[PDB]
Design a protein around this ligand. Structure first.
Ligand SMILES: CC1(C)S[C@H]([C@@H](C=O)NC(=O)[C@H](NC(=O)N2CCNC2=O)c2ccccc2)N[C@H]1C(=O)O
Length: 325
């Protein structure tokens, strides 16, 4: 009846805890979705409540593939287009990357995780168009997974938005998602641009997605995302031997009385493989690591590596390129 694979479940548990202990972190979560059905194959939380469904976080940089997809789907951006990625101001506040480049093409924006570049891609759409796009991805939306305490997330209405909000949401702040809503949204990337329902039951009928982007655009985005796990990309720690992996890192500062603090982070890592035609999505978040680094790449990449590499094995998926080990 249940779609949870005990072997992936066990693997996800062990590796989650090994990372949480190692990094002296408060809490953490792993979800593993079927990339074409939305079946949950694994879902684990450090002890306590089912954080995967009940808790909402700001996605940060693991949001960025979505505005990017939107740009490309519209016809207004091509994958080769170059953008000005310098710091710029919207009223008082300033939008910037942690490493400054003067320009990046779209592929640069993904591989390096450019806040500015993502917000330049966002800025070509009306508030309504971005809202509608995030809503269609399930941001702020009940999933009816069948779990109790299901968080809807938060998606403030576009009629209310200050201009800075459009921009900050495009690179992941001022909006909130359960890790499970976030994994789900990635089915748009994996299921040829159709958002899938999520369920913990084996399903007897093909599930029907809602079309959000073209099949051609998901394909292009998945290829862009391979850059994240190769040299020059922020998720190199996440690479799995034998396979190209489309992934996205995200490190977020936390909100304490509504101001962002520089001594408290949430590390996230979501990816799928094989990149060209994925079978699986793996999502990791770890909250408030205190030892042995705080970046997505070093905190959540290794966890992802082991859960993805062990899932592909367990499901009888063969390596698509030769090992270098
Ligand atoms: C370190 C990174 C490469 S920057 C980028 C990105 C997305 O996650 N993270 C940020 O832009 C994030 N900013 C952030 O939290 N806030 C909150 C409100 N405004 C704002 O920008 C940050 C975290 C740590 C140091 C510097 C910046 N991805 C990181 C990755 O891959 O771990």
């Amino acid at each position: 009846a249940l779609s949870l694979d005990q072997r992936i479940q066990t693997l996800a548990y062990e590796e989650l805890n090994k990372a949480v202990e190692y990094h002296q972190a408060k809490a953490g979560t792993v979800v593993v979705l079927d990339a074409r059905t939305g079946e949950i194959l694994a879902l684990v939380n450090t002890p306590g409540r089912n954080r995967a469904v009940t808790d909402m976080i700001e996605p940060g940089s693991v949001m960025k593939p979505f505005p990017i997809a939107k740009a490309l789907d519209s016809g207004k951006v091509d994958t080769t287009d170059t953008f000005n990625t310098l710091p710029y101001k919207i009223g008082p506040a300033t939008v910037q990357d942690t490493h400054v480049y003067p320009t990046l093409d779209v592929r640069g924006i993904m591989q390096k995780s450019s806040n500015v570049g993502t917000s330049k891609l966002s800025a070509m759409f009306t508030p309504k168009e971005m809202y509608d796009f995030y809503h269609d991805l399930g941001v702020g939306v009940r999933m009816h997974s069948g779990f109790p305490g299901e968080s809807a997330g938060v998606l403030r209405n576009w009629r209310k938005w200050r201009p800075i909000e459009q921009a900050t949401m495009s690179f992941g702040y001022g909006l909130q998602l359960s890790l499970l809503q976030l994994a789900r949204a990635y089915t748009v990337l994996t299921h040829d641009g159709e958002l899938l329902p999520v369920s913990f039951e084996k399903q007897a009928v093909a599930p029907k997605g809602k079309r959000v982007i073209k099949a051609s655009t998901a394909k292009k985005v998945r290829e862009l995302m391979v850059s994240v796990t190769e040299a020059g990309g922020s998720g190199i720690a996440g690479a799995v031997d034998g396979f190209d992996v489309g992934a996205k890192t995200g490190t977020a500062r936390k909100l304490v009385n509504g101001r962002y603090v520089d001594y408290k982070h949430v590390a996230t890592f979501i990816g799928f493989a094989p990149a060209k035609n994925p079978r699986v999505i793996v999502a990791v978040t770890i909250d408030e690591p205190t030892a042995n680094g705080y970046y997505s790449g070093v905190v959540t990449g290794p966890v992802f590596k082991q859960v993805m590499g062990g899932s592909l094995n367990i499901l009888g998926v063969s390596p698509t390129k030769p090992l270098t080990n």
